[PDB]
Amino acid sequence: VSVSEIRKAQRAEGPATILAIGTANPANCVEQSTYPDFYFKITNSEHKTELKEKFQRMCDKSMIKRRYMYLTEEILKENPNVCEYMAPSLDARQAMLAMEVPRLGKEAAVKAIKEWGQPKSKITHLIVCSTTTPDLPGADYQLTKLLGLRPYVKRVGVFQHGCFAGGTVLRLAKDLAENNKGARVLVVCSEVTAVTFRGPSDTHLDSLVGQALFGDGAAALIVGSDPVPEIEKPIFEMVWTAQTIAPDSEGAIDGHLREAGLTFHLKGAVPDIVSKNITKALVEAFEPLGISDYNSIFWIAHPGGPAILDQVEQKLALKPEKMNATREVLSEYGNMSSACVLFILDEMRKKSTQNGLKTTGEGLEWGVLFGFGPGLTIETVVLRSVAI
Amino acid sequence: VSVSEIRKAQRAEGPATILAIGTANPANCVEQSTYPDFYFKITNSEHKTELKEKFQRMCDKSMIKRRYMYLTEEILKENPNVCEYMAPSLDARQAMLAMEVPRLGKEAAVKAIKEWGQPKSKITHLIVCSTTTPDLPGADYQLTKLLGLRPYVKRVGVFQHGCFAGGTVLRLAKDLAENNKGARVLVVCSEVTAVTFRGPSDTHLDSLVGQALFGDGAAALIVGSDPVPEIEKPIFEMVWTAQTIAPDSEGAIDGHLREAGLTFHLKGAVPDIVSKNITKALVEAFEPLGISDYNSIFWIAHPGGPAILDQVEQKLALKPEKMNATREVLSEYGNMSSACVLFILDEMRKKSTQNGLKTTGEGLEWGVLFGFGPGLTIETVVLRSVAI
Numbered sequence: 020v021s022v023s024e025i026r027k028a029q030r031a032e033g034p035a036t037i038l039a040i041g042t043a044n045p046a047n048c049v050e051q052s053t054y055p056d057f058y059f060k061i062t063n064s065e066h067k068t069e070l071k072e073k074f075q076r077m078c079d080k081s082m083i084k085r086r087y088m089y090l091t092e093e094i095l096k097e098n099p100n101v102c103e104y105m106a107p108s109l110d111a112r113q114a115m116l117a118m119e120v121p122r123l124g125k126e127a128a129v130k131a132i133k134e135w136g137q138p139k140s141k142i143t144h145l146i147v148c149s150t151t152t153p154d155l156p157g158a159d160y161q162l163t164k165l166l167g168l169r170p171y172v173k174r175v176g177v178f179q180h181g182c183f184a185g186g187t188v189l190r191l192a193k194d195l196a197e198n199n200k201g202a203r204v205l206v207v208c209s210e211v212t213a214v215t216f217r218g219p220s221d222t223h224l225d226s227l228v229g230q231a232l233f234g235d236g237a238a239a240l241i242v243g244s245d246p247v248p249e250i251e252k253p254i255f256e257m258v259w260t261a262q263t264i265a266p267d268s269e270g271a272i273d274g275h276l277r278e279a280g281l282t283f284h285l286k287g288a289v290p291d292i293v294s295k296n297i298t299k300a301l302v303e304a305f306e307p308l309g310i311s312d313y314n315s316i317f318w319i320a321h322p323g324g325p326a327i328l329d330q331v332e333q334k335l336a337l338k339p340e341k342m343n344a345t346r347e348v349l350s351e352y353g354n355m356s357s358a359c360v361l362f363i364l365d366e367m368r369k370k371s372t373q374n375g376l377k378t379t380g381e382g383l384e385w386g387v388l389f390g391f392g393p394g395l396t397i398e399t400v401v402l403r404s405v406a407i
Numbered sequence: 408v409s410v411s412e413i414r415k416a417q418r419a420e421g422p423a424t425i426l427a428i429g430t431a432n433p434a435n436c437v438e439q440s441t442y443p444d445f446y447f448k449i450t451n452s453e454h455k456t457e458l459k460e461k462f463q464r465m466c467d468k469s470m471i472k473r474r475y476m477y478l479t480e481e482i483l484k485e486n487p488n489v490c491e492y493m494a495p496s497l498d499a500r501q502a503m504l505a506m507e508v509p510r511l512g513k514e515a516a517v518k519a520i521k522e523w524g525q526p527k528s529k530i531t532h533l534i535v536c537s538t539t540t541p542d543l544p545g546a547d548y549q550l551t552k553l554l555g556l557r558p559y560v561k562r563v564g565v566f567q568h569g570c571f572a573g574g575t576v577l578r579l580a581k582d583l584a585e586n587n588k589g590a591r592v593l594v595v596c597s598e599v600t601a602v603t604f605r606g607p608s609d610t611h612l613d614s615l616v617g618q619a620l621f622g623d624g625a626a627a628l629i630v631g632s633d634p635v636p637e638i639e640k641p642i643f644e645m646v647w648t649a650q651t652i653a654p655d656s657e658g659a660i661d662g663h664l665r666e667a668g669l670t671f672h673l674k675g676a677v678p679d680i681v682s683k684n685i686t687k688a689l690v691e692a693f694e695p696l697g698i699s700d701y702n703s704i705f706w707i708a709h710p711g712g713p714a715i716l717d718q719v720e721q722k723l724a725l726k727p728e729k730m731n732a733t734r735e736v737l738s739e740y741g742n743m744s745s746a747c748v749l750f751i752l753d754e755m756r757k758k759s760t761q762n763g764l765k766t767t768g769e770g771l772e773w774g775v776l777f778g779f780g781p782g783l784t785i786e787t788v789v790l791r792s793v794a795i
């Protein structure tokens with residue numbers, strides 16, 4: 020019994036494959052068109068008339084038609100400090116996150132496990148990602164409790180990473196499944212805006228844009244290598260992963276977990292940073308495959324905001340339809356941070372099937388998934404579609 | 408170019424190996440024998456002479472001779488709220504962590520890199536663990552900037568997992584190293600008690616024992632598969648990993664990150680709970696190897712408290728020598744959370760090389776590393792030593 024024999028008989032043989040995808044969102048649906056009226060009223064800023072008009076323009080150009088929020092008029096009426104712009108409110112928000120994050124997360128995981136069709140007891144690893152986690156144990160522990168998974172599921176919680184973490188969990192899931200024979204990784208991203216909601220300030224118009232973009236949602240996947248045919252159904256294959264920090268971007272997107280909750284900073288130069296740095300990311304990802312035409316692959320980009328998508332599109336002269344799946348999710352759910360790119364994969368495989376195309380990847384063969392966040396960090400995931 | 412082809416050329420070949428280890432602690436060294444006097448004073452509790460007696464009792468049974476603390480008398484003086492039992496202090500604490508966690512971490516990383524000998528440019532992944540992290544980007548990003556690592560180093564932050572995370576970062580590095588050819592992983596655990604320090608209250612003695620046990624420290628590792636002959640020197644090889652949740656232990660160890668900072672709680676039976684489940688963790692790890700004599704392997708156990716070591720030793724009837732390296736770290740450093748097990752690995756290989764033994768693992772071939780924390784969780788890492 021050498022380390023050699025053990026090592027060989029311990030790893031998996033094939034690439035990490037996404038075998039199921041399920042999503043969930045709080046029940047409360049908030050229409051974008053009339054959110055301003057609602058927001059300024061609930062945050063007692065109906066006098067800030069001049070600033071409201073500014074928020075209306077932000078929503079009207081957000082390219083989002085609705086979002087789902089755990090925060091309701093009733094809940095907010097119960098927590099006035101969360102409605103103020105900058106008041107001590109962390110403890111209240113932590114109580115909300117302790118319950119909703121795992122609840123919404125479980126709901127998505129249940130749909131995913133049901134599509135997968137195998138015993139939940141076969142889940143060997145669990146990755147749970149959220150913008151923040153309120154306590155110790157982290158939310159990965161609470162989700163395992165709710166799901167009733169085996170006590171020995173290997174857990175990894177991914178917290179305070181941010182909007183690019185959808186790529187992060189996929190990069191993490193790829194290695195856990197590829198290096199371990201028989202491993203089946205349940206991946207869950209669950210983001211709830213109770214962590215970021217706050218009143219408006221006619222001084223932080225930069226932060227005000229987060230309130231017009233951020234929505235709630237949870238997305239779950241089952242990832243594994245060496246799919247069992249007649250028992251499992253591959254959706255996408257992961258090929259290669261990368262993570263990088265854009266130069267001259269320190270402070271473009273950051274946050275501070277404080278007594279008043281999670282404060283956030285957004286810079287208007289974010290879309291430019293992403294656009295200026297996207298070609299580089301692609302070359303590194305696709306040149307090895309000998310791919311130069313970026314319209315010959317399917318696309319999944321974190322919809323941080325509509326400008327990021329527009330400028331990436333122009334930069335690479337992408338056909339207008341490349342970003343359809345990404346804009347569809349932005350339109351129906353808003354920016355759900357880490358969960359976005361997972362909803363997009365689901366929308367894409369679903370639309371591809373619904374409409375009888377060649378592969379789950381809009382008929383195309385190769386594809387890419389991008390996550391953007393604090394750093395500014397860029398996560399890259401090369402994917403391969405599956406024949407329908 | 409096929410995914411199947413890419414996979415084969417993309418993965419590493421052998422077991423993840425620890426190539427270097429370096430540690431660091433704040434300069435302020437606090438002796439345990441006189442801590443009660445210092446503590447009850449800085450926390451204006453001089454008058455509760457009785458509780459000051461109960462703490463001195465705790466510090467005496469602690470088996471800790473001293474600890475290193477970033478928090479100095481002066482600093483606490485500037486931060487009166489951190490010296491209360493439960494007053495709004497999170498914002499003050501975050502400022503401290505934002506600076507010290509990364510500073511101490513870089514200090515340990517630099518030492519690890521020096522032992523290693525290769526350019527830090529060869530580092531491909533970075534795992535940074537700390538009980539908490541103050542903002543977004545997480546401390547992993549800050550460490551990357553401070554060390555001057557390449558901007559495309561793949562990061563993963565391990566936050567709010569707890570005392571068992573020393574095992575967790577080992578479990579993660581193993582998959583990242585083994586599944587990526589050429590991968591060189593910098594692992595860093597950095598823990599600073601500015602997150603947990605608080606005045607005493609005779610109503611939460613479980614919180615008080617935290618004050619007699621928790622110390623500060625950072626430890627760094629370099630992990631990679633396929634060491635380059637006569638350039639890199641292996642220290643230990645990782646063979647197998649596991650993580651499990653002990654039955655009926657929920658509530659034994661937990662915390663809440665709130666406005667008053669991070670609390671800590673216990674159900675005081677933690678020691679029995681670890682003892683009771685340890686054999687089963689050991690069986691699962693070693694039956695597969697025909698090893699049943701736990702005195703025939705080397706030991707690394709997270710020193711949450713002296714009683715845990717005593718009970719594991721009692722129950723397994725281990726020779727007093729087994730827990731020596733472990734108890735020596737607890738003695739000179741106290742409980743540094745996630746960092747402990749890494750300081751212990753360093754102590755074990757040093758003492759083994761110093762006593763002219765045949766392996767880095769006290770002359771033995773196989774060994775075990777145990778991490779324990781919120782959950783209650785038990786992390787297991789099976790190691791193999793290297794001939795010296």
Ligand SMILES: Oc1ccc(/C=C/c2cc(O)cc(O)c2)cc1
Pocket residue numbers: 150181182210211212214215233234235236272273274275281282283284285354355356393543
């Ligand atoms: O449901 C959710 C949807 C989005 C978010 C975003 C959070 C966030 C936090 C930061 O510090 C910076 C930032 O750019 C974004 C959180 C929850």
Ligand SMILES: Oc1ccc(/C=C/c2cc(O)cc(O)c2)cc1
Pocket residue numbers: 155538569570598599600601602603621622623624660661662663669670671672742743744745780781
């Ligand atoms: O330097 C440091 C060393 C150790 C710690 C430990 C904190 C901690 C907090 C919890 O809520 C639960 C727990 O199991 C541990 C903090 C700082």
